[PDB]
Amino acid sequence: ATLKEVEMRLKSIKNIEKITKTMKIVASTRLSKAEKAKISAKKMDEAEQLFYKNAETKNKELIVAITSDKGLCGSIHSQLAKAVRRHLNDQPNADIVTIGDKIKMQLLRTHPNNIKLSINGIGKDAPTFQESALIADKLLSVMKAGTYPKISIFYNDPVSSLSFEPSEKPIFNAKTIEQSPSFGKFEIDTDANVPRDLFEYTLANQMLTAMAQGYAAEISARRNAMDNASKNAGDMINRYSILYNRTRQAVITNELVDIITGASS
Amino acid sequence: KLQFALPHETLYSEVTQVNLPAKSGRIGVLANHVPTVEQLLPGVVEVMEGSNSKKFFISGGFATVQPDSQLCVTAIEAPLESFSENIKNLLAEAKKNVSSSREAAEAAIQVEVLENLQSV
Amino acid sequence: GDRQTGKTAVALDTILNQKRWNNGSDESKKLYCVYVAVGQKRSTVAQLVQTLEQHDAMKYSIIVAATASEAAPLQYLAPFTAASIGEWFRDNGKHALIVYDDLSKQAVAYRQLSLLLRRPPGREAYPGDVFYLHSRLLERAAKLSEKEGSGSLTALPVIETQGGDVSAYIPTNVISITDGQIFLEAELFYKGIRPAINVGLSVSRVGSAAQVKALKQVAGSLKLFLAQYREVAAFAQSDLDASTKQTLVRGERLTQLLKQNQYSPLATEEQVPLIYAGVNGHLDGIELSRIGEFESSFLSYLKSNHNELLTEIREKGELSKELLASLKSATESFVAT
Amino acid sequence: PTNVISITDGQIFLEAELFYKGIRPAINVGLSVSRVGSAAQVKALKQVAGSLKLFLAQYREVAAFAQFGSDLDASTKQTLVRGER
Amino acid sequence: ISYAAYLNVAAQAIRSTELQTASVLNRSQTDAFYTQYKNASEPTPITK
Amino acid sequence: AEYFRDEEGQDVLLFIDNIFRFTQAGSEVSALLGRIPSAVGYQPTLATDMGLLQERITTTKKGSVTSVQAVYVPADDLTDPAPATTFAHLDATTVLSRGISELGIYPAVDPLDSKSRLLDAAVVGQEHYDVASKVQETLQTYKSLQDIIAILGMDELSEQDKLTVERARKIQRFLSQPFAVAEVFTGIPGKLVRLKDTVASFKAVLEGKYDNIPEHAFYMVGGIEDVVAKAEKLAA
């Protein structure tokens, strides 16, 4: 009918409103853990950055990007894709590590002469040292990344708990350390091959942080999207409700006419 | 001062004296120290903030006096429960299994960890 | 409220509590109840009668009966007939309570009548003068002036909402006519919260004017708390603000407190201490499962410790700072056990 | 239609949307009933189509989730994959 | 081998006690996989 | 039935089928009588006609008669005045639902859509009542959680919630009683389970004593003895 077809579509809209509401609340819960990890991680990262900066942080190229297996992370997947897309015009033949399925789909579209490594099982898990270490271990051998001048990693810097800004930063090669000369304002002889150790160490130390920053933005986006959805569904609820009410009146009238006619005869 | 950090936590990130197990042997840092990079090895670490000293089991990291005399120590996870015999039993079995079974790095770790554990 | 949610059960509870007041000497406190069983099958009313007899309520109760079989003229004139019985009491200056249950079945009888006289059936095929019919009845419920010997015929009409639609023509009309509504919520009933009252969709316009002062003091707070609890209902979907989480705990304990097992009224002198405890957040700490154990125990604990206080509270009907002080202390003592 | 539904010993609802979806004939199999059911069904065909209903019923639930278009439970994707076929 | 893989393996080996924090147990147990790709074309994915 | 109840004095078990057909019939001859049919074409005398039938069926001092009356609810709309009017007059309602039928459960009743007047706590016995409150919650938990399990995913829910779901799935298929008269509609024989036996067996399930027994080992089998036997049967 009108009455029933309105109502079933309206019911669909109601159920969707509810699911997106529910998801949004659960998202706030998840967001807290993500952010908490990110604080401690970021504190650690800054200390590493002190070395690279004070050393002079003077460094194809590599691109690493991160967006979870999980979707309904708002437009993280495609906003990060957009800031990537710009730099796939700056290097259409960049060697891509895609951390999680959602970014993988978008980047795969942007240039499929790039994709060499991708990492599954990312999204579900919150950032963890084990993962960072394993990704790092495969990365050096497989991608020869340090060989390519400049490494850059893309992540989403979690600007506010209502926003996400896609961001990139440069991971530093063994080269960065090598020809930066205020590396000499740190002292080691040859008793440690500090480039060969530290590069490997900072591959993870930066990456884990990047993932933490990303994860907080990801969950923040999920919350944002799911909130706005509840609103959009609400608007549609109201529109079909008014129609329902009018339709109800019409049914009453049509029945009433039948009765009137009957009484008349 | 000392900044001793973890990804998920922070341990000290005005620590007076730190005794550190380094790829430079063992290094001790007090206040202004010579401006160094030494890789922090898998370690049993003593950190003293004042004279009070606390002893840590750490799954290694990096140690760095900055040229602004800030000892950035970064490590990635681990106590004294960890020392407690149960680890030794498990590790003895696991070390043996690894002996029979990249394998070089693994086996080196089983032994290294056995040493690292003994250090606690 | 919704059909067969024991609408009659909610009503019957009021009647039972009127036994306590009935025993009481003042004849305003003697509300001589009239239950008007409309369209209700004789077996059902027999059970009603039997239950009333079990609770020895048949001696202030009057049951005007127009059963399912009873003819549509009888049904039509049944509330009017009932009202006249009430007039003797009202005229005698006494107070009484007439419960018309359910005017929805009265409506159907009028529909049958109108159609049989071939008068056109009004909106929703329920006769056009149904508004007029119901209104004629419903303004006989009135508290007369003191020159008319301060008396009354309190009324509590019961309307059956077929799908819960208060939008339905007979509900909308009746809502307009009356001065307050209590709208029981089917979900709450299903979730075993009996009373199943939908707090938002219940209003009384007279309201707190006709509220015991003691109970007013200790349950102004309750209204506000529940308001927050409603908003924080959806917060039950978790990491929550500490304030929100506290509200959720306080609110849940309150919801359980306002459960009252069907067919067991409570005394006002025992309503007021319990709500005070909740207001002071004493009950918040007590585990949800142990709320029930707490309640009965607390009442006995109060009864043993200070039925001097309870009787004083009952008879004063007000809660003085000294009584509320003692109550906070008493609650603390009980809370310890 | 109400009157006839009562009278009849089956209802064979068709669905227009599904006609467009390309089931042609499109039988609205959820509302398609044989009130007294089966006793005039080929014995072989009784055996084979035994869980056709169960799969489809699961498919209906699964389809609702699938049209929320989120990442799916693996069990649901067994259903989904079979269901499509 | 990666220095941090060496450190990682050490963290895992130290758990051979396990009487410690939950965040560690999660930080050392991952069921995650990884998908090799080439130029689009997919060399087979394998558990991380 | 009255002759049996009264004159033969015996108790009876009346059965009527389908009383919506009685409604339709009455609607038609109302119209024909010129008594203009009321709402949704249903006679204005529907209520009083129902009343005469229904009041006639009762427990007198002459006898006792238990009517089981089938009703067809047009297009499953019970807000329609004719089913709704009947809904009031009947003592012990049950609603048979298609979904549950499709799940294969025989009977097809949606038990969260079934309400019998006898359900009062002491009346059905405190243990029975308490068990029944728990069953209702357990099944209700599965239904409420069904949306969460569906979109958010099964496993994201609490372990406690998941155990309640697992019990509910076992209970759900412990509702499945293969029927003797569905030795032609399923081939599988009936189960006649005593009241006490049912209370006990359902109580056990709730206690989680048979959460080591598969969901499908409750499916289309009787009581606890049968449930165990089919657990063994599947195991074998």
> Are A17 and A88 contained in the same domain?
no
CA distance linking residue D39 with residue F115, whole number of Å: 34
Q: Does E38 touch chain A (CB under 8 A)?
A: yes
CA distance linking residue B111 with residue B118, whole number of Å: 11
Residue C1, annotated as binding a ligand = yes
Counting Cα atoms < 13 Å in the Cβ hemisphere of C15 gives: 30
Q: Is C149 left (phi over 0), alpha (psi -120 to 50) or beta?
A: left
Cβ-contact C331, C277 below 8 angstroms: yes
CA distance linking residue C226 with residue D62, whole number of Å: 39
Where do the H-state alpha helices sit in chain C? Answer: 7-23, 42-54, 72-91, 103-116, 130-138, 169-177, 186-190, 213-217, 220-231, 242-257, 268-279, 282-285, 289-305, 307-316, 321-336
User: Which of these, C26, C103, C24, C30, lies nearest to C62 by C-alpha position?
Assistant: C30
Single-letter amino acid code for the residue at C333: S
Cα D67 vs. chain centroid, distance in angstroms? Answer: 17
CA distance linking residue F100 with residue F106, whole number of Å: 8
Task: Say what angle helices A3-54 and F126-151 make with each other, to 10 degrees.
Answer: 60
| Residues in chain E followed by a break, C to N above 2.5 angstroms | 16, 39
> What 3-state class would DSSP assign to F186?
coil
Tokens of C269: 């002198």
Q: A92: nearest CA in chain E?
A: E39
CA distance linking residue C161 with residue C181, whole number of Å: 13
Q: Inspect the interface and report whether the beta carbons of A200 and E27 lie closer than 8 Å.
A: no
User: Which of these, E18, E40, E38, E39, lies nearest to E29 by C-alpha position?
Assistant: E18
CA distance linking residue F191 with residue F182, whole number of Å: 11
Q: Which residues of C are catalytic?
A: 205
Q: What is the DSSP letter of B41?
A: P
Cα dihedral sign for A207, A212, A213, A215?
positive
CA distance linking residue B46 with residue B120, whole number of Å: 10
> What 3-state class would DSSP assign to B61?
strand
Q: What is the DSSP letter of C95?
A: B
User: Which of these, A176, A153, A150, A134, lies nearest to A96 by C-alpha position?
Assistant: A153
CA distance linking residue C196 with residue E35, whole number of Å: 56
Cβ-contact B35, A186 below 8 angstroms: yes
> Are A152 and A255 contained in the same domain?
no
Q: Does B6 touch chain A (CB under 8 A)?
A: yes
Cα A169 vs. chain centroid, distance in angstroms? Answer: 15
Tokens of B109: 């770790």
Cβ-contact C282, C331 below 8 angstroms: yes
Contacts of D32 (CB under 8 A, 6+ apart): D11, D12, D13
Neighbours of chain E (3+ CB pairs under 8 A): A, B
Residues in E closer than 8 angstroms to B94, CB to CB, are 13, 16
Contacts of A143 (CB under 8 A, 6+ apart): A62, A95, A97, A116, A117
Q: Say which residue the tokens 């750490």 belong to.
A: B58
Torsion of CA C16, C17, C22, C28, to 10 degrees: -120
Cβ-contact C191, C29 below 8 angstroms: no
Other CB atoms within 10 Å distance of the CB of residue D14: 13
H or E element that contains A126? none
Tokens of B5: 């950090």
In angstroms, what is the C-alpha Rg of chain B? 16
Q: How far is CA A168 from CA A212, C272, F91, in A?
A: 13, 64, 71
> What 3-state class would DSSP assign to F86?
helix
| Residues in chain A followed by a break, C to N above 2.5 angstroms | 59
User: Which of these, F22, F23, F17, F18, lies nearest to F41 by C-alpha position?
Assistant: F23
Q: Inspect the interface and report whether the beta carbons of D68 and A19 lie closer than 8 Å.
A: yes
Cβ-contact B40, B21 below 8 angstroms: yes
Q: Inspect the interface and report whether the beta carbons of E8 and A130 lie closer than 8 Å.
A: yes
For residue E15, report the phi and psi dihedrals to the nearest 5 degrees: -75, -10
Q: Say which residue the tokens 């019985």 belong to.
A: C85
> What 3-state class would DSSP assign to F2?
helix
Cβ-contact A35, A157 below 8 angstroms: no
Contacts of B28 (CB under 8 A, 6+ apart): B17, B18, B19, B20
CA distance linking residue B43 with residue B23, whole number of Å: 11
Q: How far is CA C195 from CA A11, A198, C19, C87, in A?
A: 29, 69, 20, 31
Query: What residue ranges define each of the domains in chain B, with the CATH number in brackets?
Result: 1-84 (2.60.15.10), 87-119 (no CATH)
Q: What is the DSSP letter of A183?
A: T
Q: Inspect the interface and report whether the beta carbons of F84 and C162 lie closer than 8 Å.
A: yes
Tokens of F154: 């099964």
CA distance linking residue F223 with residue F213, whole number of Å: 13
Report the b/e string of C270-301 with b at 16+ CB within 10 A: bbbbbbbbbbbebbbebeeeebeebbeebbeb
Query: What residue ranges define each of the domains in chain C, with the CATH number in brackets?
Result: 1-211 (3.40.50.300), 212-337 (1.20.150.20)
Pairing mode, if any, of strands B52-58 and B25-30? unpaired
Q: Say which residue the tokens 């498919």 belong to.
A: D59
Q: What is the DSSP letter of A154?
A: E
CA distance linking residue B46 with residue C317, whole number of Å: 71
Cβ-contact C36, C78 below 8 angstroms: yes
Residues on chain E bordering chain B, Cβ-to-Cβ distance under 8 angstroms? 1, 3-11, 13-14, 16-17, 19-20, 23-24, 27-28
Report the b/e string of C102-141 with b at 16+ CB within 10 A: bbbbbbbbbbbbbbeeeeebbbbbbbeebbebbeebbebb
Contacts of C176 (CB under 8 A, 6+ apart): none
Q: Inspect the interface and report whether the beta carbons of A69 and D71 lie closer than 8 Å.
A: yes
F contact test, residue of D9, D36, D59, D73 with most F CBs within 10 A: D73
In angstroms, what is the C-alpha Rg of chain D? 15
CA distance linking residue E14 with residue E20, whole number of Å: 11
CA distance linking residue B24 with residue D72, whole number of Å: 52
For residue D64, report the phi and psi dihedrals to the nearest 5 degrees: -60, -45
> Are A237 and A149 contained in the same domain?
no
Cα dihedral sign for C95, C98, C99, C103?
negative
CA angle A45, A49, A53 (to 5 degrees): 175
Q: Does C117 touch chain F (CB under 8 A)?
A: no
Please report, in angstroms and rounded to a whole number, the separation of the first and last CA atoms in chain D.
Answer: 33
Contacts of C295 (CB under 8 A, 6+ apart): C257, C274
Tokens of C161: 């909402």
Q: What is the CATH number of the domain that holds A106?
A: 3.40.1380.10
Tokens of A42: 């970021």
Report the b/e string of F12-34 with b at 16+ CB within 10 A: beeeeeebbebbbebbeebeeee
> Are A249 and A264 contained in the same domain?
yes
For residue C254, report the phi and psi dihedrals to the nearest 5 degrees: -60, -45
CA distance linking residue E4 with residue C47, whole number of Å: 80
CA distance linking residue B71 with residue B76, whole number of Å: 16
CA distance linking residue E47 with residue B23, whole number of Å: 33
CA distance linking residue F162 with residue F152, whole number of Å: 13
* Nearest CB neighbour to B78, from listed E4, E8, E20: E20
Tokens of C240: 């929550």
> Are A51 and A111 contained in the same domain?
yes
- Beta-strand (E) ranges in chain A? 62-66, 95-99, 115-119, 151-160, 163-171
Is D85 considered catalytic here? no
**Is the bond into C195 cis (omega within 30 degrees of 0)?**
yes
Q: Write down how long chain D is.
A: 85
Other CB atoms within 10 Å distance of the CB of residue F203: 17
Single-letter amino acid code for the residue at F206: L
Q: Does A216 touch chain B (CB under 8 A)?
A: no
Single-letter amino acid code for the residue at A199: F
User: Which of these, C282, C232, C228, lies nearest to C257 by C-alpha position?
Assistant: C282
Tokens of C230: 């409603």
Q: Do chains D and F touch (3 or more CB pairs under 8 A)?
A: yes
For residue F67, report the phi and psi dihedrals to the nearest 5 degrees: -85, 145
Pairing mode, if any, of strands C97-101 and B3-5? unpaired
Pairing mode, if any, of strands C34-38 and C62-66? parallel
CA distance linking residue F151 with residue F168, whole number of Å: 19
Where do the H-state alpha helices sit in E1-48? Answer: 3-14, 22-27
Residues in F closer than 8 angstroms to D37, CB to CB, are 185
Contacts of C323 (CB under 8 A, 6+ apart): C309, C312, C313, C316
Cβ-contact A219, A30 below 8 angstroms: yes
Q: Is C93 left (phi over 0), alpha (psi -120 to 50) or beta?
A: left
CA distance linking residue A51 with residue B66, whole number of Å: 6
Task: For residue A234, give its domain range.
Answer: 1-25+226-265
> Are A18 and A107 contained in the same domain?
no
Residue C91, annotated as binding a ligand = no
Longest CA span, chain E: 45
In angstroms, what is the C-alpha Rg of chain A? 27
Third-level CATH fold of F119-236 = 1.10.1140
Tokens of B81: 């429960």
Q: How far is CA F120 from CA C261, F58, F103, F128, F175, in A?
A: 11, 21, 30, 10, 22
For residue A56, report the phi and psi dihedrals to the nearest 5 degrees: 75, 125
The DSSP result for F140-181, as a single string, is HHHHHHHHHHHHT-STTS-HHHHHHHHHHHHHHSSS----GG
Cβ-contact A13, A233 below 8 angstroms: yes
Q: Say which residue the tokens 């399923």 belong to.
A: F186
CA distance linking residue C250 with residue C257, whole number of Å: 11
> What 3-state class would DSSP assign to C53?
helix
Contacts of C329 (CB under 8 A, 6+ apart): none
Single-letter amino acid code for the residue at C99: V
> What 3-state class would DSSP assign to B20?
strand
Please report, in angstroms and rounded to a whole number, the separation of the first and last CA atoms in chain F.
Answer: 52
Other CB atoms within 10 Å distance of the CB of residue C187: 11
CA distance linking residue B103 with residue A37, whole number of Å: 32
Please report, in angstroms and rounded to a whole number, the separation of the first and last CA atoms in chain E.
Answer: 16
Q: How far is CA F215 from CA F165, F191, F199, F228, in A?
A: 11, 18, 19, 11
Contacts of D62 (CB under 8 A, 6+ apart): D72, D76, D79, D80, D83
> Are A263 and A164 contained in the same domain?
no
> Are A14 and A127 contained in the same domain?
no
Per-residue three-class SS string for chain D? CHHHHHHCCEECCECHHHHHHCCCCCECCCCCEECCCCCCCCHHHHHHCCCHHHHHHHHHHHHHHHCCCCCCCHHHHHHHHHHHC
CA distance linking residue A240 with residue A17, whole number of Å: 14
Query: What residue ranges define each of the domains in chain E, with the CATH number in brackets?
Result: 1-48 (1.10.1620.20)
CB pairs under 8 A between A and C: 24
Q: How far is E44 from chain B (nearest CA, A)?
A: 21
User: Which of these, C103, C259, C249, lies nearest to C189 by C-alpha position?
Assistant: C259
Cβ-contact F227, F193 below 8 angstroms: no
Q: How far is B14 from chain A (nearest CA, A)?
A: 16
User: Which of these, C47, C63, C50, lies nearest to C98 by C-alpha position?
Assistant: C63
For residue C32, report the phi and psi dihedrals to the nearest 5 degrees: -100, 100
H or E element that contains A251? helix A194-264
Cβ-contact C85, C99 below 8 angstroms: no
Cβ-contact F84, C162 below 8 angstroms: yes
Q: How far is A43 from chain E (nearest CA, A)?
A: 18
H or E element that contains A223? helix A194-264
Q: Inspect the interface and report whether the beta carbons of B39 and A201 lie closer than 8 Å.
A: yes
**Is the bond into D25 cis (omega within 30 degrees of 0)?**
yes
Q: What is the DSSP letter of A147?
A: G
H or E element that contains B117? helix B103-119
Q: Inspect the interface and report whether the beta carbons of F52 and C115 lie closer than 8 Å.
A: no
The DSSP result for F10-52, as a single string, is --B--EE--HHHHHHHHHHHHHHHT----GGG--TTHHHHHHH
Tokens of A4: 């029933």
Other CB atoms within 10 Å distance of the CB of residue B31: 11
User: Which of these, F50, A249, F47, lies nearest to C104 by C-alpha position?
Assistant: F47
> Are A19 and A134 contained in the same domain?
no
Exposed / middle / buried, residue A33 (Cβ in 10 Å: 0-12, 13-18, 19+): middle
Torsion of CA C197, C198, C204, C209, to 10 degrees: 70
> Are A213 and A240 contained in the same domain?
no
Catalytic one among D35, D60, D82, D85?
A: D35
Residue C40, annotated as binding a ligand = no
Q: A19: nearest CA in chain D?
A: D68
CA distance linking residue C310 with residue C295, whole number of Å: 15
Neighbours of chain C (3+ CB pairs under 8 A): A, F
